[PDB]
Amino acid sequence: IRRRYEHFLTQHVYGGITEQTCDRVMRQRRITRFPTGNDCKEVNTFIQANGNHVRTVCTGGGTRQTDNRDLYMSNDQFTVITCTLRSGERHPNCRYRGKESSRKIVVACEGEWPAHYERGVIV
Ligand SMILES: [Cl-]
Ligand SMILES: [Cl-]
């Protein structure tokens, strides 16, 4: 729960993300394909915002789907950067291309806490 929130922050929340800096952050945060081991995650999206800001999607700043009652779509647009694996199979060799877009974000909320990045939608 608190560990699920912290996992979500690690995987999906980085205010300093750019299209050209996927590789450093994916490596440093050790973001992987599976819950254990060393494998490069194929696709990973960072929301370009702070954690407390992203949390608000679960406490009034989002719309239940629903669809799936655990999923909330943000009312505001967020900038996201999607990092897609270009080469490498294991850290420290994971190389990504990054792509910025502006989207409403859809997060799974476990009560007041974001737990999963479901997707980002446009308009
Ligand atoms: Cl993702
Ligand atoms: Cl490798």
Numbering used by the authors: 5 to 127
Reproduce passages from the article.
Pyrimidine-specific ribonucleases with homology to bovine pancreatic ribonuclease A (RNase A; EC 3.1.27.5) are remarkably widespread among vertebrates. Current structural data indicate that catalytically active members of the superfamily typically comprise a polypeptide chain of 119 ± 15 residues, have an α + β topology with three conserved disulphide bond positions (SCOP12 code 54076), and employ a catalytic triad of residues (two His, one Lys) to cleave RNA on the 3′-side of pyrimidine nucleotides. Recent surveys of the data from zebrafish cDNA and genome sequencing projects have led to the identification and characterisation of RNase A homologues in this species.
The C-terminal segment follows a path similar to that of RNase A, i.e. strand B7 maintains an extended antiparallel link to strand B6. This is further stabilised by a hydrogen bond between Gly124 and the side chain of Arg107. Arg107 (the counterpart of Arg101 in RNase 4/Arg106 in RNase ZF-1a ) makes two hydrogen-bonding interactions that orient its guanidino group away from the B1 subsite, reducing the likelihood of a role in substrate binding. The unobstructed B1 subsite of RNase ZF-3e identifies it not with hAng but with most of the other mammalian and all of the known amphibian ribonucleases. As expected, its ribonucleolytic activity is significantly greater than that of RNase ZF-1a or hAng. Since mutations that elevate ribonucleolytic activity are known to be detrimental to the angiogenic activity of mammalian angiogenins, this most likely accounts for the lack of angiogenic activity in its close relative, RNase ZF-3b.2 Its enzymatic prowess is still, however, several orders of magnitude lower than that of some relatives, e.g. RNase A. Contributions to this are likely to come from the lack of interactions stabilising the productive tautomer of His120 and the more rudimentary nature of its substrate-binding subsites. At the B1 subsite of RNase ZF-1a, the position of Lys85 and the correspondence of Arg106 to Arg101 of RNase 4 suggest that this enzyme will bind uridine more avidly than cytosine, whereas in RNase ZF-3e, the positions of Thr86 and Arg107 suggest an ambivalence as for hAng.
